[PDB]
């Protein structure tokens, strides 16, 4: 396969739960192992913005997502917010790429300062110290100077700051076409195949 | 009225022509005077992403937009890319708020460095020196460190960096609901009434 | 009226509960709507430093403060520390000015880094991104370099850092005269009328 | 004794003359030698805010303060604003701790830039170059970014920035209880005994 | 005695519980008063890495450690994570030196930003503002740029960053010899006698 | 194979010769080519801390290490401190990963400033300019601000700063278990297989 | 005694050998233990500028200086430029204050960058990491921006930059009076008694 | 002639009046026009440190210095501290080199901040804006970080920071030989002939 075998997917409490669920579904279809983390505020966002009824405890959640995505047994792992025995908590774990989608401004702040107050924050801290891929998908507007400084610090270090800012150049016709644009970008960044967004200009020889 | 009487609306060559046209339409419905500027690359984007057939020369363009928006005669002014005799070129002009929507990374760069190579860039340079409102609506992903440094420099100065990153917390059902989210934010930032996006929590007394 | 119609008043766990209660009372007398937030540590400070017996749950608290201040029904709203459905949590809310009085060094840190770990921190993050008034009233001594850097970063962005450092130039005769000095400064900063602190030199024509 | 034998106490033209006089009295009661400096603006503040009738010339001033404090002959020395032959002017002097209480924003600026335009400013410049204790007690609100940058620069160098921001956690009952809080902090910082402010938690074993 | 009478010893959730317990034992043998704080994650680390069965509540914990160390009654105080009435919470407390051993990257971050979210973080914030000794003993590898910036900021302020990086120049023969190397360095830094690590070169006159 | 075929292993004069020798042995067992460099001070450290009798001249040294490690003929190359004709001296060489283990503070300084005064320093300078892997394993305590600034500068550029700070979370029972922890981290960072340190949480599915 | 029992005195190759020899003599008369280091260039300077015939090897040098100063046996220790077994090389040594007098611009550079290329440079690196007194006495003119940046970096960390810039305010009558001025300042900085330079203003009561 | 025809020589209140008087005498002997400025504190220093009885008012001072130096009529001009009609006050004046010898730390501060509070400070401000030579001769020890930052800022701009730190490499035999060393350096920097300090190595061909 091209791209990482394992992805840590963390969903935090920005608007855009749809982007996280669609990414999880795409990663499952590409036969990747997903270590799934979700914050308390992100549970509230998913309850507010979607009709997904996500169970709260990790084992129930894991069984639900496995069914939702049509995943294989053990393909999706779910770890709680204080589970320091989970792989993402330590850099001695097997290497994963990590994506925080959506990434709240609070989680962006914790990653930029190194707060490590829960497993999502520590997992990102570990990605940075081990030089493993870290993609943050903020959804906010305006972005204040506090947000922008945190994004710049992390981008300079090598994290990818990929805002949930879909393009329109393929004439999207639904909300799902816009969600898929951003998910396609995340997968492209990870090196994972995707067929939702064409390769710009691939057939253009000259003019 | 609340908010500015005159807005300079510049459209530059990022994806998201729909956001600029919808904003222009909203500003027209709120009886504002609009000084409309559009870059050459933005003309190509609007031809690519929309079915709007925008004439190229300023007088033809002005007549077309006036009809498209149902604007009053003289409500929309159109100025060419090198028209230094137009109001946005000088700080001795009557005060306007300015919005660049969509804002390409190239235009964001020119504003942050002060390049003033065309009327959009000079008009933003003038907004900054006169302390008049300047809102930039970038549409790009990932945002690189070059993009983020330019955004931070401008935000620290007092420009509003408002990415085209729509929220989902009112369960959008179409592309237009997502376009309207971002346009509502721009209007809110300008102080101009809008009824597309509710006031969060306005009826929530306690819990 | 002059000044904002709505103020978000957050009390956090620095010494000086008296300043927050007196400000709340003044804002009520000036017929303003107050969205009142209080941290867990600030509840302990108010229990320690005052004889105010503040109930813990938001509805009981709201009823108590309404009676304490002689407020109109619905004039004081109380929101809990994780209530993301409350107006201060989103920039799509109606605009309010925000004051954190007293502001602990921990809350000052969270605002400067963008931590957003509770509704007070997120509400300040939202004030900054929307360019709405934000006044922080720290009470600490010494101020360390960590405190001072956080204050400078926020002041450079446009927050007002208004320490609880009363002046003596009107020969104060009680603790309340010193509390009123600082509250008068906050109200002056907000643009809200106050008659506790005279306008310096207003009758001085020459010398 | 614990703490310094000699303190240079400079009073400059911020509000809060009471803090300087109370500190002088406490230092006298602790049998310390005080080198007392006072600016022209601080003389005006003491005339405005207190009923202390302080004579203007150094010898008359010295005799007055000696009587006011019940000091021993020669315990309080008074030096004029241009007296470069006084001990605080040179680092070849015997070592003293220095406190500027109250510290105006102008004096804070001079210390941070090294202006040395009078004996107070030079004495602080000398404390810094010799690594002798320097405590600044600003009284201002708001603190602007100019004030905060000057405070941060000096704090990073090792000066203590101790704002006149009294705490309330011992339920103060008078203006004097609040003045004594700040004076207690200064003495604590200097290492000089004081019995006005208890040692927090000293009898708390567990909970 | 040489060195401080009282030490605040905080253990946080980095690997290396052995260093904290050995330091506590050494400080007890040197007849020092210890104010002992431990984070929730550090309790899990001590359960994972050691055979010490540490009770969870502060009074039970205090009684256990008193027996483990052979301490005198009241020599070890234990305070909970939110106990703001404990001495380390306020700079008006009696002066202590503070050591965080081991220091997690999350606690290092909180100290560098001033987050004060629990008593360990606030106690370090207080050490810095009062200029009292603060020694951080991080255990992590690699150290990322986020870790290193937090360490540099604190070191520039005057905190000692003492990594758990034992030397081998006395030919250690057990894990305990390596634990004792680091503990000896901490005690040396505090000015507290220790006989585990010889004074390098003390008998070398020339060569 | 996974990871680099060739590693430049430089040992410099920090304590911890054991880490360098164990790493060399592991790299030999993984059939890697090693270009081995050692400073004069590191020779003294190895004589002081170990019972390894390392010959001083490069050919004798090469023959000794080949026997010590059970290496194949030509698998270990040894180059002298001024050998500019050796592969590590030029970026036109075949690509190698480089590790400095242990890394003295002096060598860390030379790499951060670009001093290139010997082949170890130049080889690191070359790794940086060619963007080849560079891992520094400092062993020092405390780390001063000079050390930390040099580490941050290099980490921001992309070098891995991996302190000799072993973890204890697998209950180490000997000095060798702690040496192996750090060596395992280096090999993990290089992408080279190792079976000394388990993959954290690899069998943990949920909780 | 007041001040340190042991001083590491390093002489490096700036002009002003007289200041180093006079300081060594004063420290001997004050019954201090001196660990004496001298660079190769400083030997040339002492041969050029003085009639002191200093033997080159450490034991001969030690015997010569002992006789020159009238020191007790073992009061002056001499260590060679690569003697890493000497006390100044390690922070596990007994604590000493360190003075580099004169300090060449090259040695100032090495200390500011952390080069540690000889025992003088490492000894200063160790003073900084252990927070032990470090006084640098540069003699150069002009001071370039490279010199000044190195001095500022070190001063901000807590080293004392004490240029060989004698004062004239006691009407010096010989070269020795000017040498003694600077030596008096060094001793004052160290806290060591000296009777060459009076305490400025000590008898001035008022004016 | 080589070097400038006109020099503005300002003496400010650092110790070292001898350097200023000797420089004035040398410039007179080299037939240069000198615009002489002296601060009030520098008058006190010259009264304290020398037997020069300098009259206070500019015309009397001018006549005295003309006689002291054996200058031609009009060769030395003297301007008062507030004389804005004097040539040094404006950059439209004829070009002069400027030297401040000695330069107090207060004058160094004013030049680095641009305070222009008297003619010496404004004259230096004018030298900088016109890119005319500016040489500052500070005499202070220690130099604090405030002094060093002011010196670095000015050196980076192109001012020469030439401390009064005489060399000894020509075996000086009197105070005057040391004064002449520094004066020779100033003249060398200005490009003005001097025969007090030989050209180092001028006759050394090889070795
Ligand atoms: C319905 C809804 C919608 C949003 C939010 C909340 C809720 C309930 N929050 C606020 C955010 O959740 C809050 O600051 C949390 O503290 C973030 O915590 P986590 O980073 O998820 O731990 C939020 N935060 C943000 O950065 N971007 C956003 O778009 C939104 N939108
Ligand atoms: C269809 C299409 C789509 C895009 C673009 C172009 C075209 C033709 N370009 C590139 C952009 O137009 C180019 O960098 C121009 O140089 C921008 O010039 P102006 O800032 O408009 O003068 C572009 N640029 C960007 O910053 N964000 C984007 O989303 C896009 N998308
Ligand atoms: C009685 C009392 C008095 C004080 C405090 C506490 C208590 C109980 N705390 C400490 C502060 O409450 C602690 O750092 C909290 O973590 C702050 O949390 P919040 O910012 O309120 O969420 C405190 N903090 C501070 O910054 N300034 C202060 O004056 C005080 N005084
Ligand atoms: C009655 C009164 C009250 C104040 C002041 C003045 C007077 C007369 N000033 C202004 C201050 O004195 C002025 O900026 C001086 O220039 C300060 O000079 P010194 O620093 O004392 O030399 C003043 N300055 C300040 O920094 N904080 C304050 O609280 C006050 N309050
Ligand atoms: C067994 C074990 C081992 C470690 C950890 C955890 C556990 C359970 N954690 C992670 C750390 O505990 C987590 O980031 C916490 O959030 C730290 O919180 P406190 O700083 O203790 O409040 C951890 N953190 C770190 O900085 N260095 C380390 O060596 C380790 N090792
Ligand atoms: C036995 C022994 C032990 C140590 C040292 C030396 C010796 C002989 N040195 C000092 C170091 O070797 C010295 O600063 C050298 O200048 C480093 O030179 P290289 O970087 O190897 O060229 C040393 N340096 C350091 O950074 N960390 C350490 O742990 C030690 N320990
Ligand atoms: C007679 C004589 C005089 C001086 C010098 C040399 C000699 C031989 N050198 C130059 C200095 O010695 C050279 O840069 C060395 O490299 C410094 O090395 P150390 O720092 O002593 O190891 C010199 N360097 C300096 O910084 N200030 C000075 O005053 C002098 N003067
Ligand atoms: C006898 C004597 C000696 C000195 C001083 C003074 C006196 C009277 N002063 C202090 C300096 O004069 C004071 O800070 C003035 O404010 C400087 O003002 P001018 O820069 O001359 O306007 C002083 N200042 C300094 O920077 N270096 C020094 O060597 C001395 N020495």
Q: How far is CA E128 from CA C143, E132, E156, E157, H62, in A?
A: 9, 6, 11, 8, 56
**Which tokens hold the place of E85?**
């009435």
CA distance linking residue C66 with residue C60, whole number of Å: 10
Hey, whose CA ends up nearest to atom 12 of ligand 4?
D13
| Alpha-carbon distance F140 to nearest alpha carbon in chain G (angstroms) | 9
CA distance linking residue E91 with residue E100, whole number of Å: 18
CA distance linking residue H191 with residue E34, whole number of Å: 67
Fold of C1-207: Rossmann fold (3.40.50)
Hey, whose CA ends up nearest to atom 26 of ligand 2?
B104
* DSSP bridge pairs for A38: A11
Q: What share of chain H is helix, strand, coil (3-state, %, to 5)?
A: 45, 15, 45
Asked whether at least 3 C-beta pairs link D and G within 8 Å, the reply is yes
Is the CB–ligand 7 distance for residue G139 below 6 Å? yes
| Alpha-carbon distance G172 to nearest alpha carbon in chain H (angstroms) | 7
Hey, whose CA ends up nearest to atom 30 of ligand 6?
F14
Is the CB–ligand 1 distance for residue A75 below 6 Å? no
Q: Of the candidates G169, G197, G200, which has its C-beta nearest D87's C-beta?
A: G200
**Which tokens hold the place of G193?**
């008694």
* DSSP bridge pairs for F136: F100, F161
Binding residues of G: 13-15, 39, 104-107, 116, 139, 169, 185
Looking at F39-162, list the stretches that DSSP marks H as alpha helix, in order from N- to C-terminal side.
40-49, 58-69, 105-113, 119-130, 145-157
User: What kind of experiment solved this structure?
Assistant: X-ray
Hey, whose CA ends up nearest to atom 27 of ligand 4?
D14
Q: Does E102 touch chain F (CB under 8 A)?
A: no
CA distance linking residue B185 with residue B180, whole number of Å: 8
* DSSP bridge pairs for F143: E161
Residue of H nearest to G173 (CA): H175
Radius of gyration of chain G (CA): 17
CA distance linking residue F192 with residue F201, whole number of Å: 20
Q: Which of C86, C129, C136, C157 to mutate to test the interface with A (most CBs of A within 10 A)?
A: C129
- The answer to whether the beta carbons of residues F154 and F111 sit under 8 Å apart is yes
Cα dihedral across residues F138, F139, F145, F148: positive or negative:
positive
Instruction: Give the neighbor-by-neighbor strand order of the sheet with H6-11.
Output: H76-78, H33-38, H6-11, H97-103, H134-138, H160-161
Residue given tokens 């993959």 in the structure block: F199
Taking each helix axis from N to C end, the angle separating G145-157 and H145-157, rounded to the nearest 10 degrees, works out to 160
Return the exposure string of C45-56: e unless at least 16 CB atoms fall within 10 Å of the residue's CB, then b: bbeebeeeebee
Is the CB–ligand 4 distance for residue D132 below 6 Å? no
CA distance linking residue B75 with residue G48, whole number of Å: 87
Is the peptide bond between F142 and the residue preceding it cis, with omega within 30 degrees of 0? yes
Q: Does the beta-carbon distance from D92 to G188 stay under 8 Å?
A: yes
Q: Of the candidates D169, D200, D205, which has its C-beta nearest E77's C-beta?
A: D205
Residues after which chain A is broken (C–N above 2.5 A) are none
**What is the distance, to the nearest Å, from the Cα of residue H175 to the centroid of all Cα atoms in its chain?**
19
Instruction: Give the neighbor-by-neighbor strand order of the sheet with G33-38.
Output: G76-78, G33-38, G6-11, G97-103, G134-138, G160-161
What lies within 8 Å, CB to CB, of F115 at 6+ separation is F109, F121, G115
Residue A55, Cβ density class (10 Å: 0-12 exposed, 13-18 middle, ≥19 buried): middle
Q: Does A129 touch chain E (CB under 8 A)?
A: yes
**Which tokens hold the place of F138?**
């400092």
Residues of chain C neighbouring E129 (CB-CB closer than 8 A): 140, 142-144, 146-147
Q: Of the candidates F139, F172, F178, which has its C-beta nearest E167's C-beta?
A: F139
CA distance linking residue A11 with residue A103, whole number of Å: 7
Is the CB–ligand 5 distance for residue E142 below 6 Å? no
CA distance linking residue B146 with residue D41, whole number of Å: 50
Q: How far is CA D200 from CA B15, C29, F144, in A?
A: 61, 37, 33
- The answer to whether the beta carbons of residues C2 and C194 sit under 8 Å apart is no
Residues of chain E neighbouring D199 (CB-CB closer than 8 A): 87, 92-94
The residue among E103, E106, E203 whose CA lies nearest residue E159 is E103
Residue A164 CA: which ligand is closest? 1
Residue given tokens 């030919």 in the structure block: E171
The residue among F43, F115, F149 whose CA lies nearest residue G115 is F115
CA distance linking residue F92 with residue F130, whole number of Å: 9
What lies within 8 Å, CB to CB, of H11 at 6+ separation is H17, H20, H36, H37, H38, H39, H42, H46, H100, H101, H102
Residue of A nearest to B47 (CA): A169
Cα(D145) to centroid(ligand 2), Å: 38
| Alpha-carbon distance F203 to nearest alpha carbon in chain A (angstroms) | 9
Q: How far is CA E195 from CA E26, E181, E201, in A?
A: 10, 10, 15
How many CB atoms within 10 Å of residue H55? Answer: 14
* DSSP bridge pairs for H76: H34
CA angle at A81 for the pair A77 and A83, rounded to the nearest 5° = 70
Domain locations along chain A: 1-207
Q: For residue A109, report the phi and psi dihedrals to the nearest 5 degrees.
A: -60, -50
- The answer to whether the beta carbons of residues C35 and C88 sit under 8 Å apart is yes
Q: Does D178 touch chain C (CB under 8 A)?
A: yes
**What is the distance, to the nearest Å, from the Cα of residue E24 to the centroid of all Cα atoms in its chain?**
8
CA distance linking residue A204 with residue B15, whole number of Å: 19
Residue F80, Cβ density class (10 Å: 0-12 exposed, 13-18 middle, ≥19 buried): middle
What lies within 8 Å, CB to CB, of D67 at 6+ separation is none
Mutate to test the pocket of ligand 4, among D10, D11, D13 (most ligand atoms within 8 A of CB): D13
Indicate the pairing of strand G6-11 with strand F160-161.
unpaired
**Which tokens hold the place of F81?**
């401190």
What lies within 8 Å, CB to CB, of E76 at 6+ separation is E24, E28, E34, E36, E62, E65, E66, E69
Q: Does the beta-carbon distance from G114 to F146 stay under 8 Å?
A: yes
List ligand 8's pocket residues with C-beta within 6 A: D 84, 89, 116-117, 122; G 167, 169; H 12-15, 39, 41-42, 44-45, 48, 104-107, 139-140
Q: What share of chain E is helix, strand, coil (3-state, %, to 5)?
A: 45, 15, 45
**Which tokens hold the place of A8?**
């840590």
Is the CB–ligand 6 distance for residue F104 below 6 Å? yes
CA distance linking residue C136 with residue C162, whole number of Å: 6
Is the CB–ligand 6 distance for residue F106 below 6 Å? yes
CA distance linking residue E142 with residue F80, whole number of Å: 29
Residue of C nearest to D138 (CA): C165
- The answer to whether the beta carbons of residues E35 and E120 sit under 8 Å apart is no
| C15 marked among binding-site residues | yes
Atom of ligand 1 nearest to the CA of A110: 20
Q: Of the candidates H44, H115, H144, which has its C-beta nearest D129's C-beta?
A: H144
**Which tokens hold the place of F29?**
């067992």
Strand ranges, E, within chain E: 6-11, 33-38, 76-78, 97-103, 134-138, 160-161
């Amino acid at each position: 396969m091209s791209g990482p075998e394992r992805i840590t997917l963390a969903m935090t409490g920005a608007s855009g739960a749809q982007y996280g669920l669609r990414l999880l579904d795409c990663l499952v279809q590409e036969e990747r192992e997903v270590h799934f983390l979700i914050s308390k505020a992100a549970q509230l966002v998913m309850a507010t913005e979607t009709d997904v009824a996500l169970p709260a405890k990790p084992q129930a959640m894991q069984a639900f997502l496995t069914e939702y995505c049509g995943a294989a047994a053990g393909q999706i792992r779910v770890f709680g917010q204080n589970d320091w025995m989970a792989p993402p908590a330590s850099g001695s774990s097997a290497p994963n790429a990590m994506v925080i989608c959506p990434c709240s401004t609070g989680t962006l702040s914790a990653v930029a300062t190194g707060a490590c107050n829960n497993l999502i924050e520590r997992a990102a801290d570990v990605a940075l110290k081990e030089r493993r891929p870290l993609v943050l998908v903020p959804r906010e507007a305006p972005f204040s100077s506090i947000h922008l400084e945190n994004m710049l610090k992390l981008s300079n270090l090598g994290a990818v700051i990929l805002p949930a800012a879909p393009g329109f150049y393929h004439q999207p016709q639904s909300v799902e076409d816009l969600v898929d644009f951003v998910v396609a970008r995340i997968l492209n960044t990870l090196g994972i195949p995707q067929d939702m967004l064409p390769r710009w200009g691939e057939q253009h020889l000259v003019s």
